[PDB]
Symmetry: C2
Subunit: 106 residues, 2 copies
DNA sequence: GCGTCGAGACGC
DNA sequence: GCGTCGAGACGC
DNA sequence: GCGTCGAGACGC
DNA sequence: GCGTCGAGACGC
């Protein structure tokens, strides 16, 4: 049971999820893709998978079909925001069309 | 009920509670007294009352004798740390001996 | 609300 | 001296 | 009127 | 700390 801060830092470091990435060499700012499910540029591995990994690794309930979209992602974002090691600092749209949130590691 | 950010800002503004005060004229940083109950400098009106006001005004559970110490303050501080409009940024001690936490209004 | 740490009163 | 057990503050 | 997001009170 | 469930605003 690692801290949320350490958990997310390892996920970003891993490079396992496209768009879940550092902005800087100093690794103080990271992006979390948040493209709506209804958007034509939603991509599962980018916008959906991390949320599922959060709920499988941290959640305390069975991971059923209701998590095939963004349910786990919503839960994960709430976890990141309420962590004192992190702080949402902005958001944007990439030139490839996808939506992201920006967090800073304190 | 007001948002928790609006709730605490109003409490600080009000000057009801000694030590529950702004650090700056710009009202971006406030202090919450957190002197421990068994510390020789503990003063109810400063270190205890606000926490009980939190429980009375925000909670739904009976306000019994269990809140005659720092239980309410504890629940309040947790709520303050978790709210997205606020960030705990420090801690201090004053010349009268009391301890405080510092929050920034974002 | 529990887990870790460990006050200080106690036994020898 | 140095063991016992485990206050009340605080991290989780 | 429902779906997504996610307030903040709660348990431990 | 960090899970639970799910306010009321808003997109659909």
């Amino acid at each position: 049971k690692a801290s949320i801060k350490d958990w997310i830092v390892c996920q970003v470091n891993s490079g396992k999820f496209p768009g879940v990435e550092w902005e800087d060499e100093e690794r103080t700012r990271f992006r979390i893709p948040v493209t709506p499910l209804a958007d034509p540029c939603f991509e599962w591995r980018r916008d959906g998978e991390l949320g599922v990994v959060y709920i499988r690794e941290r959640g305390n309930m069975p991971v059923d079909a209701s998590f095939k979209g963004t349910r786990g992602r919503r839960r994960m974002l709430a976890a990141l925001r309420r962590t004192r090691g992190l702080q949402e600092i902005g958001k944007g749209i990439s030139q490839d069309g996808h939506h992201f949130l920006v967090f800073r590691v304190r």
